[PDB]
A paper describes a structure:
HadA is a flavin-dependent monooxygenase catalyzing hydroxylation plus dehalogenation/denitration, which is useful for biodetoxification and biodetection. HadA belongs to the class D two-component flavin-dependent monooxygenases, which use reduced FAD (FADH–) as a substrate. The initial and committing step of the had pathway catalyzed by HadA monooxygenase is hydroxylation with removal of either halide substituents (F, Cl, Br, or I) from HPs or a nitro group (-NO2) from NP. Each protomer is composed of three domains: the N-terminal domain (residues 1–146), the β-sheet domain (residues 147–275), and the C-terminal domain (residues 276–517).
In order to gain structural and mechanistic insights into HadA, we cocrystallized the enzyme with FADH– and 4NP to obtain the first ternary structure of HadAWT−FADH–−4NP at a 2.3-Å resolution. The co-complex with FADH– and 4NP allowed identification of four binding sites for ligands in which strong electron densities could be observed for all four FADH– molecules, whereas only one 4NP molecule could be clearly seen in the expected pocket of subunit A (Inset). Of interest, two 4NP molecules were found to locate to the dimer interface between subunits C and D. The key difference between the HadAWT−FADH–−4NP structure reported here and the previously reported apo-HadAWT structure is the loop of residues 157 to 170, which assumes a distinct structure in the ternary complex, whereas it is disordered in the apo-HadAWT. The loop of residues 157 to 170 forms a lid to confine the bound FADH– via interactions with an adenosine diphosphate moiety. In the active site of HadA, the 4NP molecule binds in a hydrophobic pocket (consisting of Val155, Phe206, Phe286, Thr449, and Leu457) located between the β-sheet and C-terminal domains of each subunit. The aromatic ring of 4NP forms contacts with Phe206 face-to-face with π-π stacking and sits in van der Waals contact of Phe286, which forms π-edge interactions with Phe206. In the 4NP-binding site, a polar hydroxyl group of 4NP interacts closely with His290 (2.5 Å) on helix α9, whereas the nitro (-NO2) moiety of 4NP points toward a guanidine side chain of Arg208 (3.4 Å). We noted that, in the HadAWT complex structure, the substrate C4 position is 9 Å away from the C4a position of FADH–, which is significantly farther than the distance between the substrate hydroxylation site and the C4a-position in C2 and TtHpaB structures (5.0 and 4.9 Å, respectively). The aromatic moieties of the 4NP molecules are sandwiched with the side chains of Phe441 from subunits C and D to perfectly form face-to-face π-π-π-π or quadruple π-stacking (Phe441C = 4NP = 4NP = Phe441D) interactions. The unusual face-to-face quadruple π-stacking interactions of four aromatic moieties is the site of “dead-end” complex stabilization, which prevents the formation of C4a-hydroperoxy-FAD, causing inactivation of HadAWT.
Author numbering:
A (entry chain A), B (entry chain C): 1 to 481
C (entry chain B): 1 to 480
D (entry chain D): 1 to 482
The structure:
């Protein structure tokens, strides 16, 4: 059947070597600093067993077996919308897209290998013909069958951006041995989200100038592999769910993976050795994460606009003309992200393997627009709230004999329900005035590369030209051709 | 048959009373200050007779008569996209959207009356039953049959914004008599575009607090109607078509219409007397204009991004990383305008008479997003050009035996064709650095109300509430009942 | 003699009734939620006894008494710069302007009273001649003498912004009884910073339409007055100073003060009963908090520009031309705050009592320019750091026998010193990505009214006219 | 005496070879396309003869000669503020800062040479001891004695930015001969303002990477030098001064200068040969024009904010709270430009020659701040006007028997004076909605390099390191060593 939450939490007790800040984690599923976000993954798995959600969360495969939608391939626009409906439902069900790396997101990128596996094999260098397209498809089919969480770690160490000669010194993961059975790898995958909570690490790399072949590695290994150490930032999870209804639900840890002479059988190596292959194929893997981030950006905008409507209605600024036009900014932002999501689905194309991909240019520029504006939109939500965004009663101040009477009168705006301003306050404060929400803004700003990086890669990949179909209108107006 | 350019130029010599700055106009079709823009309408009609454009420019109605697509009703998504393609082709064929009130735009707004003529009659006050749904339909059918340009004049005078007392001292058009033949109107329709080049004036009004019943008028009268005087700003048309390839094509005049005891028969009056009717119904008339705005916004953004690509290629800054990401901004802006347009088409609804209308929130917030960003985008196009946007050879300077070799070397960038930099500069200069191009920015900024107006009206119209479907997600996250 | 830190910590244990979140505080000086910030006030008082800082931190008065510069009155430009240099050195000494309401700032507004004390009396209504302009000056000179911290609480409750009538039902502090000994006040001062840490509450009011006379209260009372309750948000202080070098130094708490039938003698009442007097004179009180806010804006801008320089150097991006222009924005922002501070001092004027005041237009518009750009400037600093703002070693990770070699190598940029990037990361994280740093952003944004508030109040007070010497040039160019 | 306006008009008819668009110019003083801007320079010269302005416009030198304040050297802050009050007065009397390259601006850069001439000589390469510091000083004394306008042409051809190696094929002015009498130069000074209206061309370069040594020429030659052609864009002057009260006052033409084997004597050669000299010293030359640009930015911000007050008052939006905070934006900008100007004066330093210079970081970052915000400030003024910015009566429409009554009622806002709204519109239209207005914006945006250039150059020249003053506080807070 489809994996359950209990099966997930049980499988975390597997020997994995995990730091979270200054601490060592006995069992990710039960430790104070990690159990809350482990239960969030459990909840994710449990949503696929909820009968009111079976139509949206699951599908019948051609074999007759019911599967999680996170394994659903899409070959047309209607199939894309069904996938987007699944991703959207998962992030709405889970604290308003507050947990952006649920397994559905992690595993989405695997579909690029399924679509066209051969080039990974044929462009390899130094595998002595042991890498097999069939084994790539086999690993992914294995992930599907067991509902395994493959956490992607691709990005380089942030060592020294001064040098193009930097990558000779790199502590980045390299191949130190190749034999009949597989490769041995040594060094760091410098950054990943949620790896302490995953089953398998999806290893990969982006091209950088001068990248040696022994650091071009796409492969998979279990989180509990001997030689693997997960090294995570301190947990930001909060002990009081009444004061912090979002931040008490757990912290989606980020951190690095140390590999000490780790063995990886050829059956789980997708490609090694070719810098050129690392140019466009890695971008094709992360495309699916870029499209997904549009779904998130839309739910996030919708939340921020919503919270603006609620708080201005409750303090009674909502009918002040100058505030109406500020709330219109946050609402316009949401409609903009909605427009880009729907436009990307309309203007899509079929890949080599005949999968339907949404419009690259629309979702990538949609992400750039989100990152350009997001912090201004949070400034606006906080600014519209005035003091109610931070200076509200603790629940015990509120319910105290002496203080209750004063609290209730100070929060007596036009839509009654005085305690409700404390509820809106709590969510605004968790989402954007705590360590826990600040991490989410950093994740959002960096996970798919930041604003200048999005723009640079999109232009390098598009190869826009004066003589290209881009310029036809300009050329005609100037009388060139 | 479909009206020809020749027929239209003939029809302009009808004794209409026109000021264009300090001059009176004997014949708008031949006067130096108007003939170039009169020929631009002539070109508009003539497009409908190009054999290679007949599928795009025309359709076959239920009688078997061929008609210009400006009279085409859209009853579903596919018919809308077919209407948008027509509009897109019209503005691409006419100086890349430099003439935004061609007759297709002007007459689009009449489809609201056709869709649901009855409320215009039934809600009329003081007409003594004289106004009939049938005659509203009969006028619009008469406009169709003769391909008439009905220029909309709705907006008030801009006299005193400080108080609502403003509508009693207003020279705004008022009914001074009602008899059994029709109405006599006296006063001003303060602002119109292209009236001097129209066949009929489409009179309307928007609600404002305390608007008297006698100023609520929706009617139609010929431009040459006795007592109608058309008073236009000075003409910005340029004399040298080589130096000003766009500004020499003609100036789409704006200005005001004086009515002195003008008689309109009941046959040509659509509604009078009801301020409440003027709240929602006029907005419904201009929805079609706001949608069309989105189409122009896309084509304008595509021309701006194309000029950025062209000029940065020509001066050889296109591969400079820091410039590449500035050009990403302008391309990003175009993709945002493409997303809103397609998304509005995708997320539309059926009106009372079963016409398909695009999503009001998406097209209205698309216009907001364009007005908020437009000046920044012009500034980046001009800033990326350097001196080449303004300081370039006149054609006699370029071709002088002595100066030619110096200009050739000065404009010999990485893609050669040195004179092509003058071709691009001329277009940038005309669009963004002449009185002629400034007028178009000002039109674009005000015609559909400015940014703070779009935001206000859109919010007032949408009755957004925290209880409504909008605040659903935020309420769930906040734990509000 | 100038008060010591020890003396100040001792005096906090005076029975003051304080909530911090869900907890009651028996002693503000020693409770884990409050002791660190309390010690920051104790540090403040001790900076005045340092013989190496004496020439900046203290002055000799007419009597020959060494007094703290927080009590120094400036009558010319030179003297205003000496006061400012004091405020600057205080904010550099205390974790880069991270504690914006040290006593020097709190007590600065009292100089408006010292300058023109009469009106406060002469415009009072229903006091029966009990309020003396003599007794306001006596209080402030008593505070001076005993280096007393007087915390300003003027702002209204945020109840209902739809209704203008909603100043009658409001729990705003009102005068319920006026007798011969003094007044009795009941209700709420809805918002204050650091009141739990202060000696006295400075009770004021700003004017809103239809403010009733019984709600127009300018007064002072001790923080431990019977019937006073201090109610503060939960404390955001961090446990581990290694991981959180700024957030572990303590949380400058914000809260409300509840007054339950609180008696205030006439000697400690400044003004009552006149909505008219509450238009101009309360703004003139907070003008000094406003000027000071520009000194902080400059130092905060300087701090942010210096972290941008430190972090872009350490990761090796500082020479990438496109990063260079982004660091340029943060450096220019600093220079913009510097320019406004120095311009405001140059174009100052004398008040009625002969005090030198910096230009109101410049320091107030300087504040608007800060609020407008600040969140975009934080965005640039964080964006410029990349992962290094947040994803970095904990200290036990750094030091581990297995991880040290990896961390040393991953952090080895052009200016070597690999652990230095963790130090920069810890400060960017604390300043801008914690509970603690966010409150400083919220405080900056609201304490002096938000941007749309600064703009409208500045316009309404300036009363800018087409016919006044603003559009002088515009009239001339127009032929009007 | 100080040179008069009329004397200036006579000096223009000196055989200079001048294109303005497709037309050759016989006399810049009198030609329809140039005569108005020629009269604005004549007005400049006549301001120094107005007895009501004698104190502001002129000084007495060490020999008792009364001289135009454009030649006044400032050795402290009081002197700098006297020079700034002079520049401010000139731009206020001349169409509210609408003519940014009056002779006072052009001639201001020459003070860098006067301050410290030796390095122009000592750093010269391949001159064989012919370039003399005393002669740079003698040229500037001669300029001062004849009140001559030296127009500065420094910037390169905008040919190909793709590779520095492309400067191989660049038609930028090069030395094509050095002999005992002087040099011969051939090619283009690609860009300059008001050269058609100047007496002498001030020639220079800025370092770009790969600039060829043979293009490193700092010199001066007359505008009518044989082998010089001035080639200007088309004139944007307007016919009807009632309808265009600013753009009818004339067009400060921009363009390029062609040198065909032009002879410059060693006496008028300041420096040749050394790209390394061209890194710092040319920026010191243009510093004075970056300071001046801040004075213009304050007067221009003052004008915009004023126009915003005047128009919102007239249509009656000025008490609408939402409009009130938008006008605060325009006023805050003016305040910001003021703040930068006054801070830069307060925080100035003495140069090697003893001249007082205002603070470089503050005037240049104030310039950056203006280029970043200017486009948005003009949008705000135009957006605040509504239609009053463009759609208003022409004067004959206003005065018509039939339309007057409608126009008077349509313009009858809370401050009466109906025709004043047309007057405000005319100014708003001319500044921001004509070709003449667009050229000023384009001038302000590029003349002192654009935003990304200002920022890039200020960072390269100040070299702000983590171990310098700018990292002192952050190091302390982070506990990093110094
Ligand atoms: C919270 C979180 C979570 C994750 C990740 C990051 C973070 C912060 N990442 C890695 C993420 O993609 C990465 O941080 C970004 O790509 C940015 O890279 P750097 O941190 O190295 O900044 P980097 O040093 O590249 O950037 C520094 C700053 O300088 C600018 N800059 C740098 N080089 C420039 C240039 N040449 N021109 C112009 N500007 C330049 C950048 O734009 C940026 O503003 C990741 N990765 C992964 O594979 N799987 C994962 O799950 C995650 N998860
Ligand atoms: C951290 C902290 C610390 C302090 C304080 C606040 C905070 C948050 N304050 C109080 C502070 O001055 C107050 O929060 C601000 O004046 C903003 O007021 P409100 O919070 O009531 O917002 P309010 O409800 O007034 O405003 C909320 C939002 O709506 C907008 N808005 C409201 N009315 C509007 C209108 N009519 N037109 C247009 N826009 C409008 C505002 O611009 C803002 O964006 C304070 N006070 C004090 O006296 N001493 C102190 O020490 C402190 N300390
Ligand atoms: O480093 N990179 O090139 C990246 C990293 C992440 C991403 O989503 C795209 C590209």
């Amino acid at each position: 059947m489809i994996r359950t939450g209990t099966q997930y939490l049980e499988s975390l007790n597997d020997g994995r070597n995990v730091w979270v800040g200054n601490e060592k984690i006995d069992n990710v599923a039960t430790h104070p600093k990690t159990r809350d976000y482990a239960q969030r993954h459990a909840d994710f798995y449990d949503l696929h067993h909820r009968p009111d959600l079976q139509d949206v969360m699951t599908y019948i495969d051609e074999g007759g077996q019911r599967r999680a939608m996170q394994w659903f391939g899409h070959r047309d626009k209607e199939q894309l919308r069904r996938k987007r409906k699944y991703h959207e439902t998962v992030m709405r069900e889970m604290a308003g897209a507050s947990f952006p790396r649920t397994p559905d997101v992690n595993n989405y990128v695997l579909t690029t290998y399924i679509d066209d596996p051969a080039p990974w094999e044929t462009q390899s260098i130094g595998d002595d013909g042991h890498i097999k397209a069939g084994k790539i498809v086999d690993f992914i089919r294995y992930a599907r069958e067991h509902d395994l969480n493959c956490a992607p770690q691709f990005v380089d160490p942030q060592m020294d951006r001064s040098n193009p000669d930097a990558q000779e010194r790199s502590p980045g993961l390299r191949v130190v041995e190749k034999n009949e059975k597989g490769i041995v790898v040594n060094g760091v995958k410098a950054i990943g989200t949620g790896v302490a909570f995953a089953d398998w690490i999806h290893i990969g790399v982006f091209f950088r100038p001068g990248i040696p072949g022994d650091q071009v590695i796409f492969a998979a290994t279990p989180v509990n592999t001997p030689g693997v150490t997960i090294v995570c930032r301190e947990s930001l999870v909060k002990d009081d769910k009444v004061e912090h209804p979002l931040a008490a639900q757990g912290d989606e840890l980020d951190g690095m993976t140390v590999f000490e002479n780790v063995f990886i059988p050829w059956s789980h190596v997708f490609h090694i050795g070719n810098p050129n292959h690392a140019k466009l194929y890695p971008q094709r893997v992360f495309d699916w994460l870029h499209y997904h981030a549009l779904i998130r950006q839309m739910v996030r905008a919708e939340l921020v606009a919503g919270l603006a409507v609620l708080i201005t209605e409750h303090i009674g600024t909502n009918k002040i003309p100058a505030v109406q036009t500020r709330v219109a900014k946050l609402i316009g932002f949401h409609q903009a992200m909605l427009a880009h999501l729907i436009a990307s689905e309309e203007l899509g194309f079929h890949t080599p393997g005949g999968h339907y991909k949404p419009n690259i240019l629309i979702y990538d520029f949609g992400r750039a627009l989100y990152l350009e504006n997001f912090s201004q939109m949070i400034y606006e939500l906080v600014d519209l709230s005035g003091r109610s965004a931070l200076i509200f009663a603790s629940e015990d101040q509120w319910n105290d004999d002496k203080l209750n009477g004063w609290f209730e009168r100070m929060n007596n705006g036009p839509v009654g329900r005085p305690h409700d301003r404390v509820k809106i306050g709590r969510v605004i404060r968790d989402l954007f005035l705590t360590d826990w929400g600040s991490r989410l803004f950093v994740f959002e700003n960096f996970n798919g590369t930041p604003l200048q990086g999005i723009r640079m890669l999109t232009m390098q990949r598009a190869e826009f030209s004066g003589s290209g179909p881009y310029g036809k209108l300009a050329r005609q107006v100037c009388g060139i051709d």
